[model samples]
Target: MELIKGQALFLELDKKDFLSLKNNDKNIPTFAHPKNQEKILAIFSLPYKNPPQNTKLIAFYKDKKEEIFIKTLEGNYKSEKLQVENKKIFPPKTIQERIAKELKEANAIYSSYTPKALFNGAFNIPLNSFITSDFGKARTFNEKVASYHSGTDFRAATGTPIYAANSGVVKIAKDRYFAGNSVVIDHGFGIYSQYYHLSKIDVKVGQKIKKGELIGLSGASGRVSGPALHFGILAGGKQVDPLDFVSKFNAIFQL
Candidate 1:
């Protein structure tokens, strides 16, 4: 319905309960579902002059194309031209598809709850390592341009332990191509922590988890060049820099 450029928004959809979710931090107006909403509907247009980071648009629809249940972007750092049009979208039978399904499910669950932490949690690096790729970085391989990076990568020797960023429940834990072993944790509200390229998984799916719990260890599994964890915290259906949140904690701890 509206266009935003270099703007940070706390958006909520118009629904039975979201009407009552209006508060100071709830920046945007409730999004009304378009009338005569087609199965593959045109929802919104978010064209922009520039973006803060490398963001990717992921649209989820009820049907394969006609209905868009949700649309979101990740990587809000800083960048050049960013144009995001909300059209009829489908989740292909791939990683993108799984992410789409997970988000839709998370929305259904959040109706009965709110985040305990105010998007103000600190993250442990899980292991000491040097970074390979940073968030929001774009890449092109063999003259084929690829998607911008979503999470920060830390490379280390194999067999290093991996810990949770915050207290949460193991939402998803599985193995797949490109990501090797993977884990997705629900850190309450709409926040999710995702870890990729794991060698071992110590946690069970759907089990309650605590902050700093050893969920897995690092490995060069999947498509990784070396043993590392591709770590991310997905909020507002986007990937925010973990450093942005963690640095603030280290600052306070030193005070």
Candidate 2:
């Protein structure tokens, strides 16, 4: 694993060159560390225009204006390598390659000098389902170990209902190496929702979908032994527990 070393929380931002202009702000204060990244994966809006290529996100934290700091992530990113296990649903190498490609394209689309962002105001889930595996848990099986699970996994059956999870332009809707029958909704601001392990996919890339719209049917499409929805949330190019946003869905939020 290629861990990306960075400054620790509460650490000042002047030391890094990638975002020297981004000094600490008062209202939307920014704090970071060379140490901990236990929770929170940084936040940013879609269409990253102000930043240049290889801008190197050195820090990531919120300021009072809600302006958000982008350089903190570069400091805390322990590694950017593909952390795959042998029993994964898809071939680890294949999964790694595909994900790498998508991340690059997604970043480009985000930073491009485009006119608009993919998502609008708020978001909602398409279906009311129970998540079997909550995000951010230390996992261990036999003698092997895996870091915190980045996404939310819903326990469902074949043909089970699956929704858009939020309103946004469908950025990706295809069966790939690991995310079988997967779909990614770019809800602007670098915020995204990824749905995986589906029995069917009914959406298409570039198609705009409303909150709670039907996307596909849940099933054991990926490496799962049974039907489930492996969903996740990303902001500022970092992974956070989707549970943070699932709350918008009244039914699931209360669950």
Candidate 3:
């Protein structure tokens, strides 16, 4: 099957044809189906932002399994390049050394394997405002450099309550140089959602939160122009649109 760079794959098995999927060194887990191993469902994302020309994913079902599926990566995404008026945050290299290291460690947690999903349903939009920016929109800062917007921006007023997109363990709940007062939810199976630029953090690290639960209050605390919320999702350690993530994998949890 052909795959897109930011999307994921859902596979359903009747009987034991695939126990798990392995792409490189990553050992992907199937949806928790302990009660009915006879039936199994697995979903994994093509996490690489810039995948190689040819990518191969392997599925192992007991001793017998299908031949390795070699799918080509298709990246036909759009670009959003513009000059920013702000001089404090546009240049990424200007970030503090400690803050940069912290952000790096936080992201490294995405590759951690959680055997089952802590959340059980569709994710809710954390804010009630309109989306100002979109995910995967390649951006250039002052014509000096370029990078993709890792998250979606919302037109949120300061102090707006940010809800937990879904139930999951809070992996990160702190402030940084770029993503100030950020919160990251570990939804398991290598799925993670990040809430950035919060004015207040109501949740704590390792806290078990519920969907729609008050996690924090939104603001332009991080690298932003004004009061806004940045919501991003990482599946299989790759950035995916928050809204697309819901429509793509929400129903499979109930299947």
Candidate 4:
């Protein structure tokens, strides 16, 4: 199969076969079925930048090994320029420390894997409004610093309700340095969905959330141009295209 950067790949295998997937000797977090009995459904994310060309995935099952080749293509991401407050662009030492601490906590949560699949079926979009910004776009801040849009942005005014993408346990529900009021849900097996720049968070950390449940209100509390909802998905500890990840994940049920 062929894949682009920042995309998720799904695989279906026999239930009895015990397998693990690796790329360039790094073990990718492969989630298998805990609910389904007939077959094993596995999913993993690809890196957004510096992805290996001519990728070879090594699948190990017992004493046997099989190689699966995939063609990796670069995403058609465009460059964008935006102007924000200088403090957000170049944070002070104290703010930098707080950002680092928050990042550490978030990374710890993303790295930890839950053996069971917490979600039932297909993932849902957090907002039904039109999308304002797409994922994987290279962004320039004040024409100085360069960064990428790690998530999809939807056009939402302040007080617009935000919904959960799927069923999961809330791992983070607090105000952040750059994300403002954020809510992160762990959908098990190293899969997480993030809602950023919320006006008000309704869920608490460790609270169980149902699919399409109202979690917060969208706003421009964080480093953004205006009021909007920044939605992101993390699979296998890598930030990927949220819409693509959802489509691929939902496709597994069709098999």
Candidate 5:
């Protein structure tokens, strides 16, 4: 199979005795298939920038190891310019510690893993609207620093209700320096979905959320030009294309 940078790959193994899967030194998380316990499901993503030319996945069983090869292709992401508040682009030195602390908290959430799968079926889009910005798009802020859009942005007016993409526990629900009012759901097995820049947050940390449940309202609370919903997904501790991740996760049901 061929893989693209910023995209995720889903693998279903028939081996009921599968132990673990690894990509080089990194251990990939796996869980029993929701529909058929006899099968195993694994998902992993390639970084948006500087991804390897090829990927080698090693699946471990009791007595044997299976190796799978996939060609990695570069992502065709476009560069876009955005103008936001100067303070957001270059925050005051006073809030440096706050930014660092927020980063630590977010990293801890993303790097965490829950052994069991919490989601039961295919994922859903948090908002149904025109995409203002896509994942992996190179963005230049105020024509100064350059960064890639780590999430997909959907156009939404202020107070537009947002829904949980899947069932999981809320990992984070608060205002962040960059994300503003954000809600992050831990779907277990190192899978997470994030909704950022909301005007209001309805969920609390550690609260159980069901798919299609109301989580918050979309608004331009964070670093943005206007009101929009930023949707993101992290699989195996790496950010992947949100829409692609959803499609791949849903495809397993076709088997």
Candidate 6:
């Protein structure tokens, strides 16, 4: 698979799928899996944004007490183009001090991993609206490229209900420069869900919430053309496709 930068790869494996893994590799970190399972899970989080797109991964497994080998080829990422009127969003210096501090504080929540997987099955889309913008689309500011869109955008009107994508502890519930009213849920096991550009925030920091629970109302609070919700999924601090996570990784719970 071609792993995108700022994204992650999640694989559900049976204990038999692998007897050993590359925990000491400099390029990849030793992943932490959920507990109480015959199935072993792995999440590989990429470190860069782009380039050298193709790669390979090595796996060591055993059958009947015999060691074996597994090799896999990975794919590349697609580049995206976007344009927006806001100039301040591009340069980091233009961001306000308080907003920068908030961003730092918000990210700190991920530094510690919660040992348990707080979610149940598949994660629900926090808003009922359809997708307004897809993930991995890059942004252009004033004819120059800016940054990639890190989250998926939903067509949420002002006051549109926003729910917890899954059960988790609320890590952050505050307003900021880029995301506006936001709520981040720590679903444990290095997985987190972020809800951005909301009209209201119903949850509080450190609060434990349930799947589909009301968390806020959606709106265009941050730097956007209109009101919408930006939903993001992160595994081991790397952003991945939320739809992919819900459709694929969620099944492990049922297994």
- Identify the candidate with maximal lDDT: 5
- Write one digit per residue (lDDT tens) for candidate 5, span 31-99: 767677678888877877667888889998988899989888865778778775235566678788899
> Each candidate's lDDT (Cα)?
0.55, 0.55, 0.75, 0.82, 0.84, 0.70
**Tens-place lDDT digits, model 2, residues 1-255:** 112211112222333322322333411123232234332222332211122222223343343222223332222212223355546555568668888897687677644322234544445554677767766544444423345566778777789888776677887888765677778887654557888888899988889888778998888876646777788876545565455444422221131
lDDT of 1 at 188: 50
Measured by TM-score, the strongest candidate is: 5
Q: In model 6, which residue pairs have backbone atoms overlapping below 3 Å?
A: 1-74, 1-75, 2-75, 2-76, 82-140, 220-227
Q: After superposition, how far is residue 125 of candidate 2 from its true place, in Å?
A: 3.4
Q: Which regions of candidate 1 are displaced past 4 Å?
A: 1-121, 140-146, 248-255
Model 4 stretches astray by more than 4 angstroms: 33-38, 80-90, 140-146
Model 6 deviation from the true structure expressed as Cα RMSD, one decimal place: 5.0
- Per-residue accuracy of model 3 over 132-214 as CA lDDT, tens digit each: 87776665555432566777899888888889888999989888877888899998888888999899999888899999989
Give the clashing pairs for model 3. Answer: none
| lDDT of candidate 1 over 1-255, digit per residue (tens) | 222321223332324322232122432222332232221211122222233233322332233221112223432443334344334566467868776666676566433333353223455676667777776564444423235566788876688888887777776787765667888777654557788888889999779887777999888778636667798755544555555535543343222
C-alpha root-mean-square deviation, each candidate: 12.3, 11.1, 4.3, 3.7, 3.8, 5.0
User: Which candidate, 3 or 5, has the higher TM-score?
Assistant: 5
Name the lDDT value of residue 167 in candidate 5: 91
Summarize candidate 6's per-residue lDDT along 173-240 as a digit string, tens digits: 98888778888899878789999888889988889899988998888887558878899988866777
Off by over 4 Å in 5: 35-38, 80-91, 139-146, 253-255
In model 2, the worst 10-residue window by lDDT is 1-10
Candidate 1 has which clashing residue pairs, if any? 39-66, 39-67, 40-66, 40-67, 52-77, 52-78, 53-77, 53-78
Q: What is the C-alpha local distance difference test score of candidate 3?
A: 0.75
